[PDB]
From a paper:
Human coilin-interacting nuclear ATPase protein hCINAP, also known as adenylate kinase 6, is highly conserved in eukaryotes. hCINAP is a typical α/β protein with a structure common to adenylate kinases. Adenylate kinases play important roles in nucleotide metabolism by catalysing reversible transfer of the γ-phosphate of ATP to AMP, forming two molecules of ADP22. Atypically, hCINAP also contains a Walker B motif characteristic of ATPases23. Here we show that hCINAP is required for human 18S rRNA processing. hCINAP is highly expressed in cancers and promotes cancer cell growth through selectively upregulates the translation of cancer-associated genes.
The essential role of hCINAP in 18S rRNA processing encouraged us to explore the underlying molecular mechanism. hCINAP is an adenylate kinase with high intrinsic ATPase activity. To further assess the involvement of the enzymatic activity of hCINAP in 18S rRNA processing, northern blotting and ribosome profiling were performed with the enzymatic mutants hCINAP-D77G and hCINAP-H79G. Comparison of the crystal structure of hCINAP-D77G with that of wild-type hCINAP showed that no significant conformation occurred in the substrate-binding pocket of hCINAP-D77G; only a subtle conformational difference in the NMP-binding domain with a 0.354 Å root mean square deviation was observed. Wild-type hCINAP rescued the processing defects in hCINAP-depleted cells, whereas ATPase-defective hCINAP-H79G or D77G only slightly rescued production of 18S rRNA and 40S subunits. Nob1 alone showed low nuclease activity, whereas addition of wild-type hCINAP but not the enzymatic mutants strongly stimulated 18S-E pre-rRNA cleavage by Nob1. AP5A treatment did not significantly alter 18S rRNA abundance, suggesting that the ATPase activity of hCINAP is involved in 18S rRNA maturation. Interestingly, the ATPase activity of hCINAP was strongly stimulated by RPS14, suggesting that RPS14 regulates the role of hCINAP in 18S rRNA processing by acting as an ATPase-activating protein. The association of RPS14 with hCINAP was decreased by the addition of ATP, but not by AMP-PNP. This result suggests that ATP hydrolysis by hCINAP modulates dissociation of the hCINAP–RPS14 complex. Collectively, these data demonstrate that hCINAP functions as an ATP-regulated switch that interacts with RPS14 and Nob1, and is required for Nob1-mediated 18S rRNA processing.
Author numbering: -2 to 172
The structure:
Amino acid sequence: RGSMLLPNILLTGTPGVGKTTLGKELASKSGLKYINVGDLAREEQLYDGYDEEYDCPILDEDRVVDELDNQMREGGVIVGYHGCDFFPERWFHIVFVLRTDTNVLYERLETRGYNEKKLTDNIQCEIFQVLYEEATASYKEEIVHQLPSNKPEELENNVDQILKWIEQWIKDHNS
Ligand SMILES: Nc1ncnc2c1ncn2[C@@H]1O[C@H](COP(=O)(O)OP(=O)(O)O)[C@@H](O)[C@H]1O
């Protein structure tokens, strides 16, 4: 019922940690909408510049924000991306940074067929905790949380914890 106020959630962390697997499952089991920012920019061609080095077009951050702004004002969206400093702070009610042990994350990305230089850049992003610090610099510390994401059983505990959070938030914000 388009009579209920619904929350917005950010899922962030290094490529490989489990963001899209977790977001699709939360969407199926809550009725909220999951948007993968990478897939959105491909579908709507939201790019400015090309990367010869990595062989890929470069994300246009301001056109991403314009494209999503009205949907975000209406509520009930889960957003997934490997960055977060350029999103409006007002968009999110809670932020989760997914974390994966370096040994486990290395094997996930190798099987996806990343080359040597791509492997190294992402493994260093995780061991230096880059996305965790970006989140704490951009949102209030009490709404930012780290989630372990190394095995099926952790995926299952994350789904259960976030589904319960969503049910309690809806009760508190529809008196
Ligand atoms: N908790 C988990 N346990 C084991 N494998 C996982 C877990 N979460 C995700 N994966 C797997 O890791 C790989 C990358 O997950 P994905 O959703 O594509 O990462 P991201 O969206 O952050 O780049 C996929 O093969 C997926 O099945």
